[PDB]
Design a protein around this nucleic acid. Structure first.
Ligand SMILES: [Mg+2]
Ligand SMILES: [Mg+2]
Ligand SMILES: [Mg+2]
Ligand SMILES: [Mg+2]
Ligand SMILES: [Mg+2]
Ligand SMILES: [Mg+2]
Ligand SMILES: [Mg+2]
Ligand SMILES: [Mg+2]
Ligand SMILES: [Mg+2]
Ligand SMILES: [Mg+2]
Ligand SMILES: [Mg+2]
Ligand SMILES: [Mg+2]
Ligand SMILES: [Zn+2]
Ligand SMILES: [Zn+2]
Lengths: 127, 214, 100, 82
RNA sequence: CUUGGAUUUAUUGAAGACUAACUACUGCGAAAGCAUUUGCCAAGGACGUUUUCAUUAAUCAAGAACGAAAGUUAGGGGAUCGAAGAUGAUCAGAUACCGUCGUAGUCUUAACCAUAAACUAUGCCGACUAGGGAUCGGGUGGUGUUUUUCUUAUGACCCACUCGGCACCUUACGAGAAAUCAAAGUCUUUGGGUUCUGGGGGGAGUAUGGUCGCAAGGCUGAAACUUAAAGGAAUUGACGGAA
């Protein structure tokens, strides 16, 4: 009965994605991003924008013909953060509100075994 | 201006019969137009889905299974356990401080030309009574355990022609065996397979594949 | 200038010079001892959002998993916000885990 | 242990506790366990810390496996003390 | 910065990197340093020992062995960060942060170099002095507990003692200028055995010569002249875009 997707929320700092796909992954549905719904450069990762994006994605899904999703969350990963952004949670909330159903939530952030050299240099990033 | 959302074709994902259900869900592709065909495009599509999705029960909500599309037969598309997996949020909780973990990787040619890499995580046990905050096994002991695990893998992969191996993996029999083997060296907790990766593969072997589904 | 501490970078004693770790926030190379290793075991869903998720969702009980991030901080960085918390001379000797 | 220990005669317990060296006089606590094998009726005066795959007088029976300290007496074997 | 879907989604391939989680007041190594696998190759401490030699021992100016990083020559690669350099803001200005990019490298392989806050800013060997628990590696004893294939026997703990290295509290009568120190104690109640180093600050790790180097530099190392303080530790303040 329930037609599924995989939500894929790439929640980096300074932008969020919501990238709904089929179960194989190849054929997408909607790729809606934070910077797409709020033209302010700053307001990309910002929650409201993320929420809007999520809503848009949901709408797209509805148009297509899908009922449920599998939340996968990706923080920037590897050389950066490994910390889910400000607007992943917000996006999720938005999705929930939309009524597009939810099943099996994961964080598939690519946390390495032993990364190749990080940002900054040795003395780091000195504001 | 094209818009290929109307120009689409929906197909149903057909799982192997080792699990409860032989049907995962619903994928899609473009039509089989001249020059670029549909079946061809399909053959080679990895559906990574939960093992609780297939089996039904929440005991196997600690697992995942990559499923590679091989044969496209009458819309429905037959897949093969291309991989077995743990999602990050399962094994991350099991790695806790103040107790040693034991990984074990094993390359194994099955009876068929299918080089399986099969992993095996196994944590060390905080015993009953223990006041030593730590439960660290000696390096030597750990090594021994790893060796044992490898041996086990060699025994039970290689043998039984790959399909059967998957089935065996399914309800943790291998893990249990490993645990049993260990108990003389060191007690251990959990003990799992974690992943299954795959290298080589021969001609598609269509008849054989079919003989799974029936 | 006298020694503030006996330990200093702490774990390095009878350990020549250990391997290092990169900080989360700064990406400053900090030795994996003078490190400040807080363990962020957050739930994958936001507190108020959990209810929403439940309302949305299929199944019962659910995974509702936790993300696991062992965060390393370059001392200075930690002092700006994190668990550090500048103590008095006599209070520095106390190594017991705070709160609790 | 404080002020007036009276050091020539300790209680034997203390001596037992302390290192085989760090008493009044040096005196070891290794023993010549007089082992009998299951086979031939003859007694081998086996030093308890063998350092050797201890055969019998002639027959290849294997009496004691030399563990780092005291020897594990291989299988169901019987022994006298010293 | 692209959109003539870059990014994002999914399978691969190539390359050389690294080797998280594990990871601790944890372990080893003469230090520098060393954490995936298995294997190989030798060496090593601790231990245990009713084994064997009998002064072979302790420390060391000559000389020797190693020796982080960078740099260097010469080879491979180059992902990111990234001295150089481009470049975008900010300020009276700012070739500075911040920002974006990013040759050399970073990483490696063959040669060097021989320096570090190579810092425990604590030479080594020896002995003795006060409590305590732990903690790693050995080794004893427990009709202790569980494993369970019936007694088991290994294993793994529990407890006590044992020797061993990378580790708290009080009084110090011992110390110490004090922070503090169970050694930095057994020193004007001055002598266990040794090597090395220092003699107000600067001038100066310079000049010079030696010597060592491909170089960069290293080891070695002045004086003239100058100057009343330079330091250390803490105390009270004042202050801090610290809490
Ligand atoms: Mg200061
Ligand atoms: Mg000074
Ligand atoms: Mg050491
Ligand atoms: Mg060092
Ligand atoms: Mg260790
Ligand atoms: Mg590892
Ligand atoms: Mg010399
Ligand atoms: Mg170099
Ligand atoms: Mg820069
Ligand atoms: Mg400028
Ligand atoms: Mg002078
Ligand atoms: Mg001062
Ligand atoms: Zn930082
Ligand atoms: Zn005989």
């Amino acid at each position: 009965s329930q037609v599924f997707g995989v939500a894929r929320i790439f929640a980096s700092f300074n932008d969020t994605f919501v990238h709904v796909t089929d179960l194989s992954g190849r054929e997408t549905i909607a790729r809606v991003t934070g910077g797409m719904k709020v033209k302010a450069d700053r307001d990309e990762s910002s929650p409201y924008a993320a929420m809007l994006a999520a809503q848009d994605v949901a709408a797209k899904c509805k148009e297509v013909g899908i009922t449920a999703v599998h939340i996968k969350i990706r923080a920037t990963g590897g050389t950066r953060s490994k910390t889910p952004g400000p607007g992943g949670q917000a996006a999720l909330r938005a999705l929930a509100r939309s009524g597009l159903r939810i099943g099996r939530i994961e964080d598939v952030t690519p946390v390495p075994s032993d990364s190749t050299r990080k940002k900054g240099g040795r003395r780091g990033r000195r504001l | 201006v094209v818009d290929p959302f109307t120009r689409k074709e929906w197909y149903d994902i057909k799982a192997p019969s080792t699990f409860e259900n032989r049907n995962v869900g619903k994928t899609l592709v473009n039509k089989s137009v001249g020059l670029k065909n549909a079946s061809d495009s399909l053959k080679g599509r990895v559906v990574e889905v939960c093992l609780a999705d297939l089996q039904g029960s929440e005991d196997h909500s600690f697992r995942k299974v990559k499923l590679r599309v091989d044969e496209v037969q009458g819309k429905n598309l037959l897949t093969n356990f291309h991989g077995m997996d743990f999602t990050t949020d399962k094994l991350r909780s099991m790695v806790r401080k103040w107790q040693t973990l034991i990984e074990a990787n094993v390359t194994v040619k099955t009876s068929d030309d299918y080089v399986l890499r099969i992993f095996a995580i196994a944590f060390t046990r905080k015993q009953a009574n223990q006041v030593k905050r730590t439960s660290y096994a000696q390096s030597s002991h750990i090594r021994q355990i790893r060796k044992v695990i490898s041996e086990i893998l060699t025994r039970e992969v290689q043998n039984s022609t790959l399909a059967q191996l998957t089935s065996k993996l399914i309800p943790e029999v291998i893990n249990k065996e490993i645990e049993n083997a260990t108990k003389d060296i060191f007690p251990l907790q959990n003990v799992h397979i974690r992943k299954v990766k795959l290298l080589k593969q021969p001609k598609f072997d269509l008849g054989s594949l079919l003989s799974l589904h029936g | 200038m006298p020694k503030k501490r006996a330990s200093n970078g702490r774990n390095k004693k009878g350990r020549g010079h250990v391997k290092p770790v990169r900080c989360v926030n700064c990406s400053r190379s900090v030795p994996k001892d003078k490190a400040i290793k807080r363990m962020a075991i957050r739930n994958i869903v936001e507190a108020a959002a959990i209810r929403d998720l439940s309302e949305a969702s299929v199944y019962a009980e659910y995974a509702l998993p936790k993300t696991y991030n062992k965060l390393h901080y370059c001392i200075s960085c930690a002092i700006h916000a994190r668990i550090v918390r500048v103590r008095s001379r006599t209070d520095r000797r106390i190594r017991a885990p705070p709160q609790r | 242990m404080v002020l007036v220990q009276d050091l020539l005669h300790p209680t034997a317990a203390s001596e037992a506790r302390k290192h085989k060296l760090k008493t009044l006089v040096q005196s070891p606590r290794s023993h010549f366990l007089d082992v009998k094998c299951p086979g031939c009726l003859n007694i081998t005066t086996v030093f308890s810390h063998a350092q050797t795959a201890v055969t019998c007088e002639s027959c290849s029976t294997v009496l004691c496996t030399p563990t780092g300290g005291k020897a594990k007496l291989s299988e169901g074997t019987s022994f006298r003390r010293k």
